[PDB]
Every structure is written in C-alpha cells, then in structure tokens.
C-alpha cells in the first residue's frame, strides 16, 4: 500500500531525500508521518501532519507531499542518522494504519578499518571469537586446531558507532581441547587475515 | 511507556501484553517480526472506536482503561508468524507548549515457539560468557558502562542462544526470571 527504496545513502554534511509512494485513499487524502528507527530501539516520530515536526526532532528533518507521493529530507548529515526510515499514513479504504516497507539509509565516507579480534578460552569446552570495530560490515572466518582446519558464527551486524561486529563459536569436549597443543580464530576482512591463538 | 507480558507464547496459545499510560487520545499496537518492517496491529480512539488490521482482526484484542492507566493487547491463535517486537504507542499530540507528542513502548520480544524456557550459565571469559539460553533476549550490565561492548546472541544447533560480553557482568535473562552476577 506504501512504497518506500529499500536504501539510501547520503555523505556527511550533505542531504538524502526518502521518497513514499501511495494512492488516493491514503497518502492522496490523508496526513503522512515519519518515523526513524534506530537499530534495537523504538520508531521515533520525526514528522506529522505531512510536515510538521514533533518537539525535539532536530530541523534537519522536513518533510512534503506531492499529490500521492511524500518524501522525508534530510540536511546536515551525520553518521548518527544511520537508521531504518517508515512512512505512515490512514487508508481510508482499508480503515487501517498503513506503514511503508522502510528505507535504510546509509551514510558513506567512513574509512575502512581492520578488526578488533578477541579470542577466549574456556574457562577452568567453548572457544569465544569476538571480531569488533570494522568496516565494511563482511568477515571470513576460519578455525584451526593445531594446524588443521562445531562452528558457529554470527552474521555481521552494525554496532551503534555504524561499524560492524560478529562472533564465532566453537563448540568442543574437554577432552578435545586438551588434546592439542593450540587453538586459533582466523579471521579474513578485505584479503587482510589476522590470527588469534590460545593454547591448553 | 512501560510494556510488560510473556516473551514466550506457546503455538494456538494467547499472547497478552500491557502498557501503561498516563493520558493520550489514541492508542495502538505495532509489530516488528525480526528483520523486517513495521506491522499496525490496532488502535482505539478516546472515543472507543476501534481499527484492526483486517489480516489479523480475527485473533486480536485491545482494550484501553484510562483511569488504571493500562492499555492491553491480546492475540490468540498465535502461530511462529506472531514472533516479533510489538510496541504499543500511544498519541498525545500538541498537549501544552509541546507539539507531536506521540510515545512508544521500548518494545517486547515476543517469540512464539513450544520450546521450553532456559536460563542461561555463566562463564568467566576480559568478559561474560552468556550461554545455552531461550528465548532471547539476554541483558548484561557492568556493576562501569564505558568500554562495554555485548554482542548479537548466535543461534547454535542447539535451538539455544549465548552470547558475548566484553569490557562483575549481571546477566539479566527474564523469560527464564534468571539474573546472574
Ligand atoms: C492529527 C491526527 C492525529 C492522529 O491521527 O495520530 C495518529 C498517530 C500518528 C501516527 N501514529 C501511527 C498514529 C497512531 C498512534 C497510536 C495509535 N494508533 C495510531
């Protein structure tokens, strides 16, 4: 009933525009809204009544409505306005509260970065590799037991600073972690491969 | 608002949750299953006229109660089609100086499974281990909040959530009423 681009991007300092196409029983006769969402966190008006915003809501956001079609907009932008954007709006037809599919606004211009990489052992059998900090937001990870290639990892996902984090696990028998002089998280972002090793 | 209910429900069971609320003139439900959109469930107006999502208007339930400050969802029949974060929202609008108010819930995880409940157990990693639990979600908080970085729970073969947390960890897992330190 409302559609939305699955994404955006905009450069920081600069503006992105977020367009919401509908018909006439609800973008056409009735007030759009917008909501940011961050993720993990609750939708946040940013606009009503088609252009208005909510106390608290910075004047970077505005908003229009151009017949069936409303758009978000959004200037000065930072890092922090990284999110999942939904239009709202009544459908007369449908008596019912109907909502856009979203848009994922990305913004560029963040350098790449090499990961943080964690690995745990097994308290007095679990293997804990933490990757953190990088960007782009895709990690090969492998796993070694001394030299030779139960592994479960994370997909990538973003952290709040818009870099990206994941976790591998590695499930083995105290018997099996005994049994080797070492165990190591290899991890591959950008054909740059880091090792991390902990030994029995 | 303050949202509260089960975050477990099982299959063809109900699944209820409150939100308290001190006013507004409408109020509503809506959901989020993981990784998707945004889903309207329902609103009442203060009038009592009532909307549900015409794909769901069979199964659900809301009811508002001004003067016991609580408005409630119920949702029976769920399916694994119900799993998601539902807030409930409620619409003030220009009330004083203030203009648009409208204020959300923090949102409940609601996962719809036949699965048991199971807290999780506690490692030493430096950092917290937070392992074998069900459902999600687990919290963790450091006695210290700078340097703290928790990370996205992994699903393993098992059908059971751990996670990681780096930087005493309190490992709060609510579905199971569990708190480690
Ligand atoms: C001027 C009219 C105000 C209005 O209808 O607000 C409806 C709010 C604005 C957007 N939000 C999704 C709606 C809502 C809020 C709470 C329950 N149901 C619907």
């Known amino acids: 009933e409302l559609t939305q681009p699955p994404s955006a991007s905009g450069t920081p300092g600069q503006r992105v525009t977020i367009s919401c196409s509908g018909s006439s029983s609800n973008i056409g006769s009735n007030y759009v809204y917008w909501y940011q969402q961050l993720p993990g966190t609750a939708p946040k008006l940013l606009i009503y009544r088609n252009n208005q915003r909510p106390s608290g809501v910075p004047d970077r956001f505005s908003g229009s409505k151009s017949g069936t079609s409303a758009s978000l907009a959004i200037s000065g932008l930072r890092s922090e306005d990284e999110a999942d954007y939904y239009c709202?709006?009544?459908?007369?037809?449908?008596?019912?509260?109907?909502f856009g599919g979203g848009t994922q606004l990305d913004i560029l211009g963040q350098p790449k970065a090499a990961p943080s990489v964690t690995l745990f052992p097994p308290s007095s059998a679990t293997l804990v590799c933490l990757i953190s900090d990088f960007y782009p937001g895709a990690v090969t990870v492998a796993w070694k037991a001394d030299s030779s290639p139960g592994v479960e990892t994370t997909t990538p996902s973003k952290q709040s600073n818009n870099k990206y984090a994941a976790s591998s696990y590695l499930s083995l028998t105290p018997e099996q972690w005994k049994s080797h002089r070492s165990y190591s998280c290899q991890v591959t972002h950008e054909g740059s491969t880091v090792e991390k090793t902990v030994a029995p | 608002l303050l949202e509260s209910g089960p975050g477990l429900v099982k299959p063809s069971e109900t699944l209820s949750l409150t939100c308290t609320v001190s006013?507004?003139?409408?109020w509503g439900w809506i959901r989020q299953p993981p990784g998707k959109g945004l889903e309207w469930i329902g609103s009442i107006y203060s009038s009592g006229s009532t909307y549900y999502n015409p794909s769901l208007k069979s199964r659900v339930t809301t009811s508002v109660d001004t003067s016991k400050n609580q408005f409630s969802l119920r949702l029976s029949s769920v399916t694994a089609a119900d799993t998601a974060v539902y807030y409930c929202?409620?619409?003030?609008?220009?009330?004083?100086?203030?203009?648009?108010?409208?204020?959300w819930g923090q949102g409940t995880l609601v996962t719809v499974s036949s699965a048991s409940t199971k807290g999780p157990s506690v490692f030493p990693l430096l950092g917290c281990l937070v392992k074998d639990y069900f459902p999600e979600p687990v919290t963790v908080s450091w006695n210290l909040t700078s340097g703290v970085h928790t990370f996205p729970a992994v699903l393993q073969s098992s059908g059971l959530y751990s996670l990681s947390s780096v930087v005493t960890c309190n490992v709060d897992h609510k579905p199971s009423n569990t708190k480690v330190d």
């Open positions: 709202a709006a009544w459908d007369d037809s449908l008596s019912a509260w109907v």
């Open positions: 006013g507004g003139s409408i």
């Open positions: 929202v409620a619409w003030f609008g220009d009330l004083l100086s203030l203009k648009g108010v409208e204020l």
